[PDB]
Amino acid sequence: GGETGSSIESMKASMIVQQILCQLETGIDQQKANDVIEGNIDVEDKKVQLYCECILKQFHILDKNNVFKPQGIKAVMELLIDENSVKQLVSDCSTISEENPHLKASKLMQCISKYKTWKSFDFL
Amino acid sequence: FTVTVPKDLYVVEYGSNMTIECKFPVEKQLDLAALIVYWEMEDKNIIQFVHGEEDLKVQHSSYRQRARLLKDQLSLGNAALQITDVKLQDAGVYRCMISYGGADYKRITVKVNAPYNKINQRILVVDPVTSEHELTCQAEGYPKAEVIWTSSDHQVLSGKTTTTNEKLFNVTSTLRINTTTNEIFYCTFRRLDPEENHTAELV
Ligand SMILES: NC(=[NH2+])NCCC[C@H](N)C(=O)O
């Protein structure tokens, strides 16, 4: 459920829209949502988890059955990091395996964020 | 800040157009610089209009020219999605997120009701010596339908019904009968799961 575009501005737009909408679904504090965006990801915080889950599924990085999808993460991180660092992100964050799906979402956000925080979009 | 919706479910005919609305509060003049309007279906982006600009690059190709935000009406706190030639993929749960000072979202349901409303009819004199005629009815819609033939006596006759198809069904029914002039027969398309009985008359 969501979108994937190919120009920084379209992406920044989709970033601000999906962030707002996932705050609306989850209820997450604005400050916690920023920390998520900023890299500061409390993996075990349930509101953090739900926001990670909403937002990764909106950008189709997790599919309906919580499966990590390389296509969607490429579409988002192509705009913040190089091609090879994208390849390395895919392979590193593919090993994340959690039967707790929200815990899985917060851990992927961790794993992605360690390559570049998503607030880096605000910096483009 | 509270986004609202006049109808929670739209029931719209296959091919006929569609406009689904989402209201939101506008006290003073509208400031397009601070408005965001996002429509999505399921696994599908429909409208992403942010800061005056409708992002055409994120809109799904299957909406890429059928759908559009009614920009004139935003100044009326009315975010209206319009969709031309409603197909069968267009059915499902939509969502409208608005952001203008605050932010809210609402969901709308859209069934594409295809009742077997345009019944076609044909009568063929198979045999003028035996008065054998062939009476046909042909209609099209999404829930499959059976066809029941009845003479003027309202006794049930037996006809041959062939059902084919992407998601819309085409149901052709034929009745061979030895009948005289001015006699009336009736082809009813029972749309089964949704009871939308429609009876066409053949004279
Ligand atoms: N005597 C009859 N009314 N026969 C109907 C045959 C219908 C045909 N087999 C079909 O289902 O496509």
Numbering used by the authors:
A (entry chain B): -4 to 119
B (entry chain A): 19 to 183, 188 to 225
Tell me what the authors wrote about this structure, in their words.
Here we use a geometric deep-learning framework operating on protein surfaces that generates fingerprints to describe geometric and chemical features that are critical to drive protein–protein interactions. As a proof of principle, we computationally designed several de novo protein binders to engage four protein targets: SARS-CoV-2 spike, PD-1, PD-L1 and CTLA-4. Guided by these general principles of molecular recognition, we introduce a protein design approach based on the critical importance of the fully buried patches of the interface to drive protein interactions. Overall, our surface-centric approach captures the physical and chemical determinants of molecular recognition, enabling an approach for the de novo design of protein interactions and, more broadly, of artificial proteins with function.
To test our fingerprint-based approach, we sought to design binders to target the PD-1–PD-L1 interaction, which is central to the regulation of T cell activity in the immune system. We used MaSIF-site to find high-propensity protein-binding sites in PD-L1 and, unsurprisingly, the identified site overlapped significantly with the native binding site engaged by PD-1. Two designs based on two different scaffolds showed low binding signals, which we refer to as DBL1_01 and DBL2_01. Combining mutations from both libraries, we obtained DBL1_03 with 11 mutations from the starting design, which was folded and monomeric in solution, and showed a binding affinity of 2 µM, comparable to that of PD-1 (KD = 8.2 µM). To experimentally validate the binding mode, we co-crystallized the designs with PD-L1. Overall, for both designs, the structures showed excellent agreement with our computational models, with RMSDs of 0.8 Å and 2.0 Å for the overall backbone and 1.0 Å and 1.9 Å for the full atom interface for DBL1_03 and DBL2_02, respectively, showing a very high accuracy of the predictions in the interface region. Whereas the native PD-1 uses a β-hairpin to engage the site, the designed binders do so through an α-helix motif, illustrating the ability of our approach to explore outside of the structural repertoire of native binding motifs.
